[PDB]
Structure formats: C-alpha cells, structure tokens
Amino acid sequence: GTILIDLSPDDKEFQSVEEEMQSTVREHRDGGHAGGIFNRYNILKIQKVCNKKLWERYTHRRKEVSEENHNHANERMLFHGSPFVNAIIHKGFDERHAYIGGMFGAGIYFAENSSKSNQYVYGIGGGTGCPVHKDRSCYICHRQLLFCRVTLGKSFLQFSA
C-alpha cells in the first residue's frame, strides 16, 4: 500500500526537510567511523511516504497515549536510519526494527540529529559500509534515511552519556 512521491527542489516542503537534514548534522565522537566524514549532504531526492493503513495504526495509538496523559501526545519529527528502510516504509515499524542492545532497552530508536541516524544506515556501527565499495565513508554510493513522526506521551527522562 505504500507509494513514494518525489518532491521538487522548488517545493517549500523539500526545502524545510532538506534544512532539518542539513542543519542537524553534527560531528560524532567516533570521528566518522560509523557514518563517514562530511559536513553536509548532496540531497539527490526527497520522497513523501504515503500508506493509509500504517497512518491509522499510528493515530489510534496516539489517541490512547494522549488520553492517558491529559490530552497530550507529545509528538516529534525525528530521524531513523537502517538497512531496512525499504521494509519499514512498506510494513511499518515492529519488533524486527528494535535495537535489542540499545542503551534504554529493547525498543525502536530515533534521533534529533540526522547524522546520528546516518551512522545506522549500513547497520549497527555502520556495519561494513556500502555494498559496492565496502566503504563506511563512501562519497559515490547513494544512502537513505527516514524522517518520522513519533508519539512520546509521558516520557521517562533518563539522564545519560
């Protein structure tokens, strides 16, 4: 049920998503090991993901959370990077997309920094880099990230490094 619509570079929505992508690049403490060395991206394409069933599944849960939390979903737009982004856009998030070894337990992880999600595009820790050149810093090969809508509700604040 999923379709992908190309946004024109002239479109304000392309421009605001490119800006959140470009503006939330940071340096990482691994010096680029996991995601590569770069300060900016060459954005080749931005596509809107539309799937009716997955959207309704999201809004249902969003209402349950909201009603348990004085009518506040606490919704955010956050990045997600993975070798399975082509499965996620078709079947949605589920326990197969969970980071069993993550710092906050077995769940599904999202980032405010685009460059944090870029570290997971070729796998946990960047895996072995691009399929074609085996390069975690490949400048030739095309990469893909998801920019996602996420419901936090009453969030348990974990302080951490």
Partner: protein, 47 residues
C-alpha cells in the same frame, strides 16, 4: 521488545556529557511512529 517503565509511554535519552548532541528517544510499541519522508543523499567530501 521490552516494556516502557510502569506509568510511562517512551524513554527520553537526554544527553548529559556531549553538549552538542541532541536527544534520542525510544518507543516500545511500533505503532508509536510513522515514516513520513524518504531522503536519498550522498555525504559530501569536505573541500
């Protein structure tokens, strides 16, 4: 997949060392997220 802490719907991982890092978040139900945009890109080699 684990459960969220009793009385809560997600976890916020607040950075408490790297002052430039933004937050990270964890949900325990896949239904709490929706993939809005697919972005195709190259990282650019600094000049």
């Amino acid at each position: 997949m684990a459960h969220s802490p009793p009385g809560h719907h997600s976890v916020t991982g607040r950075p408490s060392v790297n002052g430039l890092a933004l937050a990270e978040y964890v949900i325990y139900r896949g239904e709490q997220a929706y993939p809005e945009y697919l972005i195709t890109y190259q990282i650019m080699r600094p000049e």
